[PDB]
Amino acid sequence: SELLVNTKSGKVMGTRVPVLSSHISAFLGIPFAEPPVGNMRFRRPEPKKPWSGVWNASTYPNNCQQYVDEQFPGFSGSEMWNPNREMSEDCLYLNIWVPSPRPKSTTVMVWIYGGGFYSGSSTLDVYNGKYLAYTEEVVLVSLSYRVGAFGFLALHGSQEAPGNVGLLDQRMALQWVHDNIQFFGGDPKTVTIFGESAGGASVGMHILSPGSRDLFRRAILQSGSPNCPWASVSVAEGRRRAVELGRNLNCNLNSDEELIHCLREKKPQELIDVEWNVLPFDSIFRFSFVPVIDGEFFPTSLESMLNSGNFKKTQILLGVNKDEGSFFLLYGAPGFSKDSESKISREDFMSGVKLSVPHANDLGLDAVTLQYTDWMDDNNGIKNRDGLDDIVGDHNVICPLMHFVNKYTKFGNGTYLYFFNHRASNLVWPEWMGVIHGYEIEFVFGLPLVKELNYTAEEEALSRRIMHYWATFAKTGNPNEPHSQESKWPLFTTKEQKFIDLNTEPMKVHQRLRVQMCVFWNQFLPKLLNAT
Amino acid sequence: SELLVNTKSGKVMGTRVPVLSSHISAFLGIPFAEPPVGNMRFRRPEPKKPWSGVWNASTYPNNCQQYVDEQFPGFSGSEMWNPNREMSEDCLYLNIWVPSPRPKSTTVMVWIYGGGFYSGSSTLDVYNGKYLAYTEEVVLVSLSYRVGAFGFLALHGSQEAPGNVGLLDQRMALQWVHDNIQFFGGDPKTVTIFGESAGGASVGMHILSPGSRDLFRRAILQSGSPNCPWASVSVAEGRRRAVELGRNLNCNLNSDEELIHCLREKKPQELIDVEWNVLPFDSIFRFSFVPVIDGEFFPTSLESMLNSGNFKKTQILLGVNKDEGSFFLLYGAPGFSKDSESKISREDFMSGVKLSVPHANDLGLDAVTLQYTDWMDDNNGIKNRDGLDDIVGDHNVICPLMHFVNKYTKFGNGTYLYFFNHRASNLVWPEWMGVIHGYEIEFVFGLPLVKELNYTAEEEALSRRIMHYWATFAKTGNPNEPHSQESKWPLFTTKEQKFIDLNTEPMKVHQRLRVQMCVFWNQFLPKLLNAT
Ligand SMILES: *[C@@H]1O[C@H](CO)[C@@H](O)[C@H](O)[C@H]1NC(C)=O
Ligand SMILES: *[C@@H]1O[C@H](CO)[C@@H](O)[C@H](O)[C@H]1NC(C)=O
Ligand SMILES: *[C@@H]1O[C@H](CO)[C@@H](O)[C@H](O)[C@H]1NC(C)=O
Ligand SMILES: *[C@@H]1O[C@H](CO)[C@@H](O)[C@H](O)[C@H]1NC(C)=O
Ligand SMILES: CC(=O)SCC[N+](C)(C)C
Ligand SMILES: CC(=O)SCC[N+](C)(C)C
Ligand SMILES: [Cl-]
Ligand SMILES: [Cl-]
Ligand SMILES: [Cl-]
Ligand SMILES: [Cl-]
Ligand SMILES: [Cl-]
Ligand SMILES: [Cl-]
Numbered sequence A, B: 001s002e003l004l005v006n007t008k009s010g011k012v013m014g015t016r017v018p019v020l021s022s023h024i025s026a027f028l029g030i031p032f033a034e035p036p037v038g039n040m041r042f043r044r045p046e047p048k049k050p051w052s053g054v055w056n057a058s059t060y061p062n063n064c065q066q067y068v069d070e071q072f073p074g075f076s077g078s079e080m081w082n083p084n085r086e087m088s089e090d091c092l093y094l095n096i097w098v099p100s101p102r103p104k105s106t107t108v109m110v111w112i113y114g115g116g117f118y119s120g121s122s123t124l125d126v127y128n129g130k131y132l133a134y135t136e137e138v139v140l141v142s143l144s145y146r147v148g149a150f151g152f153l154a155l156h157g158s159q160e161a162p163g164n165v166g167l168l169d170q171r172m173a174l175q176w177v178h179d180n181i182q183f184f185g186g187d188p189k190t191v192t193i194f195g196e197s198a199g200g201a202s203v204g205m206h207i208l209s210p211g212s213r214d215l216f217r218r219a220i221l222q223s224g225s226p227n228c229p230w231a232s233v234s235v236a237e238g239r240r241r242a243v244e245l246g247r248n249l250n251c252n253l254n255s256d257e258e259l260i261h262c263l264r265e266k267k268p269q270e271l272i273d274v275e276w277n278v279l280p281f282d283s284i285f286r287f288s289f290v291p292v293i294d295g296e297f298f299p300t301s302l303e304s305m306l307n308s309g310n311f312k313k314t315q316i317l318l319g320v321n322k323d324e325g326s327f328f329l330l331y332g333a334p335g336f337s338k339d340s341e342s343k344i345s346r347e348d349f350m351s352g353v354k355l356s357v358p359h360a361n362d363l364g365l366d367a368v369t370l371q372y373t374d375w376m377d378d379n380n381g382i383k384n385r386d387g388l389d390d391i392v393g394d395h396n397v398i399c400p401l402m403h404f405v406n407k408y409t410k411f412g413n414g415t416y417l418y419f420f421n422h423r424a425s426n427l428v429w430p431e432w433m434g435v436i437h438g439y440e441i442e443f444v445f446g447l448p449l450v451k452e453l454n455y456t457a458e459e460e461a462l463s464r465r466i467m468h469y470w471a472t473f474a475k476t477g478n479p480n481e482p483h484s485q486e487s488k489w490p491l492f493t494t495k496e497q498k499f500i501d502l503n504t505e506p507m508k509v510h511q512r513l514r515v516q517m518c519v520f521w522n523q524f525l526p527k528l529l530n531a532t
């Protein structure tokens, strides 16, 4: 049976799924680790004990315990990202979409979901890999990993809650793929990992961590980089937040042992109810439990690893969206609302700047303000709004990514950079938000090819062009079709620094993405803050 | 006799001079102070003892002892500013151009020459007031004052060389005008003082100093402000330079008395030969002997006087030229030459920045560089050149002036601001230098009306329009002709901050002159340098 596969962990039975007037195989909910429940909470993941009989992989698995966005009840724009299955700590499973007939040794792509390390699900409609697997004929895998305190609580020095376990969950799934994907017709030697925001930062982290490098061939990072200011904390900061979390749950704080024991006796939702209370500052685009620079998963500081070339050298494809910051301003910055144009007063602009650069002294805040203020029209509510939007995106996603791309390219084997600036015609979010964080994903997964979703024909063409870039890159390490007719996406070099726009218009090439602002964030501001 | 005038100092005999197919009276070289020679060198000026008989005021007087520009021997562009008479310490005289027939009580305008306080002459061809006196029918006076060590050596606490004497020379001439101008048909109650660069800074200094306020009605400042970074030094810095000057002349430095005695025994040229050796830093647009904030001529700091409104409240008309810095970059910045386009390398740009902001630490220099660098095209030699040009002009003239105008306007009785950006068609200096420092003067004095000078007809029209703005302002405190047909030069207000362009095109109104860059120089950079 085409739907029956025998793996080293045991046999699994898939299900036939329809896709674009055709069909393919799907193996949903395959376990790759033992349930991290009970006393295994906060601990590293243990490999799934092989099973007897046949595992039913016909339906999606539970989602990991996580905070749920209720900011706009019933609104599809926000709820499309929420868990669409039952939540449980028993959530370590993976999904596989296999072309029909089953391949013998084709390209593999593993998706790592984003969500600021505090949320995320592999089962979202926007992550359904059947379209991509079918259209580009690749084996598409989507993994899962613990988020929130469950996956990143960090009490360095301890073995019950070392930190980064959520990252180890990812690695274990990659290990499972490396060991069993052949049985599904996948080529374990041509695996490409890709993800967005926290997932993109994750991809970069596996590129850096020695213990992950051998498990994949190349990588794609979307709107996320390992060096982002929100993607990691020091061991001391991680410890402070863990203790503070315990303080919120009236725990005994005399020892790690006692703290960990107390937290383990709490129900999942109890940890989630107070998770946001441990942030050090009033801020936006900052999440409580994220990876920790432990000296283990990460040997040394991210920057020193990047400077010395201490990382996997291969090919990478990465990029950003035009308005990465709008979402986080809506949810927390004063003056922004979902149903208004959100024109920002000068006062609110100032408040926003402070929320955006929490680690800044007055001089730093002044530098940022001056850098993003048009002094010939400083009371222009639209410029203030758009200016704040740029500040958040530049600081949190674009400039950190540009720093990563420039450092990696010095030792890498090929870089491809993109700038996604197409706002979908069927977007339910307001116009002022522009090309939102995470809204290139629907194009990467081919949702536009689905007529009932109501995208324009041009948007379907873009989706197909993007899916082919991604799949072709995953297969050859070059997004371009050898001996092709269409325009060529040029390599990004240290000298030329070329990139392309990804939109419904004919491809255009540019150079030095957001260079003026990124010199500010990556060189000047840091010097200023350090000197003061 | 129309050429014979009897003043409180004695009788003077003028000369009839031709001007634009007509004639007027001229009284050249009238003394207003005793010769500051011998033991009077460095001392405050003493009023000229009245004389018996008739003083021959038919020819120009000697020029004060000063450094002479020999950077381009035979070049008119530079030599037109050099002394055109014999130099002597006996140089305290004034010149008067009186309409014919002699008026009874008309508007008076007193010109104060510029030249960085280290040079200048009232007898330059470009300062001939016959055209302005004739065309606008005003009594035009041009004074003189000691420059260099002779007029500004400052050993605060001493009475032999207190400092600011060159400014006192100016005041004495203003006093003389206040007492005797009536005899020449001038109205001592409607005197307007005006000057360019150091002369413009001087005008502002008389507006501030209590001892000068009662001697004039209103003021005009061209490309200069009292608060310019080069226009003054502290008493301690003034003292350091005086001592260092003495050290250069192998003087006894045991006491002010001995230092002053030694300097007085030196020949004029001996002081001038080493004058530039006392500057504290390698720099451009910085002059050795300038006014000193002594607590006497200036009661308190310039900034505190401006904030509290401790200054003469009247009407003022002021402005700047488009490329104030080009001249000083040519003479000292590496990479600039008179006969080349002076395209600047990135290295030379960096060196220039350092020469331009001598009081800056590395962080400050980085701030300036970032502020004026186009990172999408940082090796563009023309942008680098023009960028440096802006840095020098913004820092040394424009932003300081904008700071002054905004502070004065809060307490003043009417402000008129202009931006002069017309490059003369017969300019002998290279094109890259643009609208040079001091090149609006020829238009203020009506040289374009002289056919043999070869200006375009449009340039003659501009000159006449500027001369009428200046003269009309001097007369009424408003440059605009009451019930006029031409466009109106609007008042500059704290809120609107309107100004006009002065060029051969039809008047245009703008707002917030160089606001973006001046917020940098006037608010941000100072904070940065103070915090670091
Ligand atoms: C699980 O597998 C069975 C076949 O053994 C199938 O009938 C069922 O639909 C699958 N999922 C469930 C329990 O609904
Ligand atoms: C990638 O590496 C191969 C050798 O392994 C080399 O020949 C090729 O030029 C490299 N390409 C890039 C873009 O560095
Ligand atoms: C000085 O005045 C006399 C008349 O007494 C005149 O002849 C002469 O030209 C004037 N200047 C000189 C000395 O040339
Ligand atoms: C100038 O002062 C007079 C009173 O002395 C006042 O009436 C007039 O409005 C003032 N004008 C300006 C521009 O301040
Ligand atoms: C980007 C986000 O979803 S903000 C997190 C929710 N919070 C504001 C209630 C803490
Ligand atoms: C602006 C200037 O004339 S520079 C002064 C002359 N120096 C360079 C020889 C000291
Ligand atoms: Cl077998
Ligand atoms: Cl086996
Ligand atoms: Cl479908
Ligand atoms: Cl708090
Ligand atoms: Cl960069
Ligand atoms: Cl949507």
Ligand SMILES: [Cl-]
Pocket (backbone or CB within 6 Å): A427, A428, A429, A430, A431
């Ligand atoms: Cl909408």
Ligand SMILES: [Cl-]
Pocket (backbone or CB within 6 Å): none
């Ligand atoms: Cl008489």
Ligand SMILES: [Cl-]
Pocket (backbone or CB within 6 Å): B007, B008
């Ligand atoms: Cl008398």
Ligand SMILES: [Cl-]
Pocket (backbone or CB within 6 Å): B018, B019, B020, B450
């Ligand atoms: Cl003439």
Ligand SMILES: [Cl-]
Pocket (backbone or CB within 6 Å): none
């Ligand atoms: Cl030196």
Ligand SMILES: [Cl-]
Pocket (backbone or CB within 6 Å): B402, B403, B406, B515, B518, B519, B522
């Ligand atoms: Cl200003």
Ligand SMILES: [Cl-]
Pocket (backbone or CB within 6 Å): B076, B077, B426, B427, B428, B429
């Ligand atoms: Cl000239």
Ligand SMILES: [Cl-]
Pocket (backbone or CB within 6 Å): B427, B428, B429, B430, B431
């Ligand atoms: Cl020329």
